[PDB]
Design a protein around this ligand. Structure first.
Ligand SMILES: OC[C@H](Cc1cncs1)Nc1ncnc2[nH]ccc12
Ligand SMILES: [Cl-]
Length: 167
């Protein structure tokens, strides 16, 4: 039993809800919130900009130190950093950005990072401003993640389309 509320159950392990991931994280304070990161951990817009704003820029400050020490992430890769006031940990995961010409096949690799964590609050990787098809991102999530994932879909109209089209 966990404290996630109001989710539709898609499979044994994947749940979905129309919600603002920032507000969800503040309410649940999950062990792991997933950020839709880029390789530079520059949290400007989309989920990343919103999460970082909610931390009063502490996420960005921590991220800049991480990059100065370790260099950029790989597309498809991840790192674990603090969750600040939102969660215990933030798993920064880099899905491919179609608006940069990155290989959509890397989306499966990106979702594989979720399997290192028993329970996660997450967005659909490569969706939104990353330019991939969200219906595809959900399919890859369901077919790749084996741990318990609670998906927050900000757009109510998109959420209804994802539910009604889910196979
Ligand atoms: O796939 C990630 C989606 C993509 C979008 C598609 N249409 C509108 S945003 N983004 C978000 N998802 C959940 N919470 C969020 N908070 C802030 C952004 C955000
Ligand atoms: Cl987005």
């Amino acid at each position: 039993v966990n404290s996630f509320s109001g989710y539709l159950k898609l499979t044994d392990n994947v749940y979905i809800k129309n919600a603002d991931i920032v507000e969800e994280a503040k309410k649940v304070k999950p062990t792991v919130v997933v950020n839709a990161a880029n390789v530079y951990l520059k949290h400007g817009g989309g989920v990343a900009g919103a999460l970082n704003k909610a931390t009063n820029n502490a996420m960005q400050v921590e991220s800049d130190d991480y990059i100065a020490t370790n260099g950029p992430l790989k597309v498809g890769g991840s790192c674990v950093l603090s969750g600040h006031n939102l969660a215990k940990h933030c798993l920064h995961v880099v899905g491919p950005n179609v608006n940069k010409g990155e290989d959509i096949q890397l989306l499966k690799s990106a979702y594989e990072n979720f399997n290192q964590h028993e329970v996660l609050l997450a967005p659909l990787l490569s969706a939104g401003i990353f330019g991939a098809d969200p219906i595809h991102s959900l399919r890859v999530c369901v077919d790749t993640v084996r741990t318990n994932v609670y998906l927050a879909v900000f757009d109510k109209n998109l959420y209804d389309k994802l539910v009604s089209s889910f196979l």
